[PDB]
Assembly symmetry: D3
């Protein structure tokens, strides 16, 4: 290894310059099944990394974990290697009523409701995804025809207070997030995620490229529990897109 947290070498890159970065470690493999010569690298703490070929060209897939902090570490060290491109592919809950459950969302920029973004750029700097990577997502959805909309995504640090989830121990929410739910709704914000803003701020301001795709588990306005575990084939429907987006980048 050359690097502390990832535990990988420059030779482990395999010549690759691009990395796909999902949040769940056990879904890194799900991506690797759609690629050639799947080779594992390491799985420590939250971070699980994999090696595979796309069109036979080298590409790495590594797990970020939960939140900016965990994400901030991997994205940095992959770039240490280094990568020039990152792909997010996170699971999310939508806050817009007109959007249905199980839809795929491309994000242009992210609301900095996190604190991890401030480490790379001041609050004024927009958490915006790279145009090349952004285009790729819709262009990958162009082939599939997935439900997709254009809009902004909220990126909170906390699961419960930040997204305004009340069935909790405290049952309390600070003034900042008091009425935050519809605050983003009338703003046109599509969903609540936790990893985007950090990544996007980390990339745009460090001369790096990144895109953002998300699969809806549930609409926060709607009442019915997601149709699990049948609808999970649609989780691959976002997976098949993010994979396809890596072609057209070569």
């Amino acid at each position: 290894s050359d690097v502390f947290h990832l535990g990988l070498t420059k030779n482990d890159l395999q010549g690759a310059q691009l990395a796909i970065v999902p949040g769940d470690p056990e879904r890194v493999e799900k991506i690797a099944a759609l690629m050639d010569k799947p080779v594992k690298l390491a799985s420590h703490r939250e971070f699980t990394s994999w090696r595979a070929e796309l069109d036979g060209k080298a590409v790495i897939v590594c797990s970020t974990g939960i939140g900016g902090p965990s994400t901030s570490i991997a994205v940095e060290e992959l770039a240490q290697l280094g990568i020039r491109t990152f792909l997010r592919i996170g699971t999310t809950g939508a806050i817009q009523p007109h959007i249905n459950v199980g839809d795929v969302l491309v994000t242009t920029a992210s609301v900095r409701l996190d604190g991890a973004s401030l480490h790379f750029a001041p609050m004024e700097f927009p958490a915006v995804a790279d145009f090349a990577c952004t285009t790729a997502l819709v262009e990958a959805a162009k082939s599939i025809g997935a439900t997709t909309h254009v809009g902004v995504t909220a990126s909170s640090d906390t699961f419960y207070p930040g997204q305004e989830r009340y069935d909790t121990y405290s049952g309390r929410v600070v003034r900042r997030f008091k009425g935050s739910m519809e605050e983003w709704q009338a703003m046109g914000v599509m969903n609540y995620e936790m990893e985007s803003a950090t990544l996007l701020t980390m990339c745009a301001s460090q001369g790096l490229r990144a895109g953002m795709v998300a699969g809806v588990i549930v609409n926060r306005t709607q009442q019915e529990i997601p149709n699990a575990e049948t609808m999970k084939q649609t989780e691959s429907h976002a997976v098949k897109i993010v994979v396809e987006a890596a072609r057209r980048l070569l």
Copy 2:
């Protein structure tokens, strides 16, 4: 009138839902030079408007004037009229050596140095331009085929200090902005302009689509004066407007 500042009416629009927004009152008619049938409707104060048609459909061009505040006035009222699309064209100051004079820059998002944006959405909210608009903009600059680069733009609320200019009467700059342009170098900001941050935040936070495009008459790193006053950005706009039209 319907509104207190523009002086436009519902008839003036002709069901127009797209508006081009430059910064110069004197270049509004200059934009209609590639458009069809110009006719003037109201030219009050900073805002000069010329009704025209593109492909048989109503289009308007209205100057924002200089600054976020004045721009917000245009966009809001134009929208009240019934416009949801806004394409801004102007000139900027480049920060990158690979960018030359004569090259057009397109903005993905704005560094919100301004304060008018805060009236639409808090600092945490990003200042992004519409992807449908952005696609057209990039696919118009290549449709022209001029040297074009895409990235982030810093939108100051002031011309001199906010863009770190020391040639001024004082020659001093606040700490936040003292050496900030150098800080902006590594952040990867292409250009400086003064209207986007308010424009993009007010549109993204109201469910409105807006595009941003600009040419370069000066590079901040470049210590050179532009060739004299005859030496794309406008033709692109109409073409960019054509796509979503």
Copy 3:
């Protein structure tokens, strides 16, 4: 020419170090009708300036336009030329009931609800009008029997959201300003304008003299926006008052 936006040279001032700054360019020539030997200089963009003389000395009246940015440019640009004293005439709407239509308003300092002011000084540094500029206005407001109000005024970055006008496309006002005029009302703030705080800050922090005067055309609280144009000769009051005040500093 020396500058860029105004496109003028110092010689055009003929040794003038005083400038009047309105928003409306068409008013500029109307203002210079109260001074003598008026000479037009240029109308590049908003920034319409004019050459006049009062009491033997040269006087300049240059337009800025709505918004601090516009103000900041001209006021900066007039300085290197260069004016050292700045008096602003404007058109405003008050939030206090006792202020009726046809009132002349003078401000001691301004609420920094803007962002342009922040480029000259932190949010702590007050945007205060210079005493020599303030007293002359008051001394002039009392003479011609004009209705005078002295105090603090709010300076919004935006016209519609900032001054709390809900009758707009969206029909919503952001949290920060949702209930903002409720506060200013009880603070004793006089009137709503857009250019005062910025001008004062850049002058008080750069060692310059700044005056501020405006005319009432509408009341925010009072149900009715008054009949569009009839009586606002009040501008004459507002312009007469600033003219007599301007003569003194010379």
Copy 4:
């Protein structure tokens, strides 16, 4: 005893609509020694209240002590009594070498480097003295013949680090104030004081007239220290001014 901290009532006021409010418990009597019918009232903690009259009308001289918080309670409780006009006399440290030792300073506005001001006004609201109270201070300093400088005075919440003195026992300065002092003088800040901003905003905030004047004690730049022990006649020189301004202000 309506008040909790002052230990007083109107009954001791008595019938006064003006309050002179220095920041030194000891000096209160010496101020009242220039006032007709001087009557001691009470001395509790920071507060030291005397009753007297000037030109036939009642005047209140009560010490606020050191600090905004100490000032703030005094204002609330006096105005409860209540004063509409508050006049503070003080001693300050000059940061401008262009200002000479032994002069008098009249403050139009104060940089709110305190925390108490935030309790009465958002940071955007300026800390400005009323036009009437400020003009008489100007006139009085002329009327007595003291060298007058009028302007803006930085109002810190601490004596050592807030006014940029590395002579702290630790010998360090917080980042927010590191290099702040040389940052203020170029902006035109005349001196350093500690209580005006609190008085200025809340009075401007609460509905009341306020004036500020203070005696110069020492210069930050000038290496000449005030002579012991009666170079503090500068306060007495300024004391001539506070009463004379009060003599016109009622």
Copy 5:
């Protein structure tokens, strides 16, 4: 001789390195009366410093007065003299219903509603008391047999607005502080005080030892207002605590 404000020369403390710092100047001595060889040191402004012997070893008692600003100077000017431990005792306002009059409250760390603290360390930096100093406070309070609670205290910069006192001259509380007491109460905050946070912040950031113990004369949720002598009786009950607390730290 030897510092500016206190006016104390260092031998006058007899090498003492710990100082009890109550806020009431004429209430300072009743604490110092329990220690052997009670000696007045001096009385400048609000500060009445006493020197005493604990275990026959020298200890100091100084007045802070009202507010962080005035408190900051004392602790600071006490620091050059060799004092590195400061134990603050005063009257506070509880906001939790379960805490009733006669109960003394020890504070571990404080909600910094102050301004003075910000001059030593950023808002990110906690206003926390020393562990060894804090154990002792309750370690003595229990010995006395006092009803004592342990937790967090909100520390305002103003008596009234910051503690959301409603019946005031204008009867208004600022937008920032509208309903803050309810926030702190639900957040688990014990009491209200004006001086700890600044004392806590500096000493924690200056590398000093700091303790906070206070007697409740009033609870805020409590519709009541402190009634002598139960309040005043409990003061000695708290004096005995902080005095006994002083012996351990010496």
Copy 6:
């Protein structure tokens, strides 16, 4: 399941109300291996929970992961179970030269350079550890006889910028974190970790007991770098103190 991320049930607790929560999933085993009846509970995502018994009482060791957001979720879910006591143990970086390699760190309060803590309490609120947990933790270190330090801890959202690390791709960090380590160097902060301020704030706000103990696995400041490869003795030596403290809070 009842919760979402952990997938735990209150029966798996078996009436446990206390929890040791290190970030790493792998280590958790060893923490329970020194406890009695080591029972693995569930192992999903980054969150591996275990159930143990010490002193006859039910105890729990669950992994939180890296950074605030995940830490917020785990503590939230665990508290819903519900745990009421949280003993955080992790690795860290020494910023004080005197704090040597192999030293145990006890934290009273933490510097909030994180963003998740803003979601439970405004930045004014201190990220302070509960005294009961602290004392138990401190006295545990006392019982063992291991090098220990008591103090303040910094908590960044991000691993590299927030802790002043240069060797990254760009090699740059935002101005906010410029020489910020030197700030803490002088202010007296002890170490660098990524999780505490969330926990401390979360619990105190919530509010509930929590504790933090940690171990030196690096000193950036001292010339000495830590050895490879399992040299970080403290991690096992520090958990001995926390499991000792775990045995005491019951």
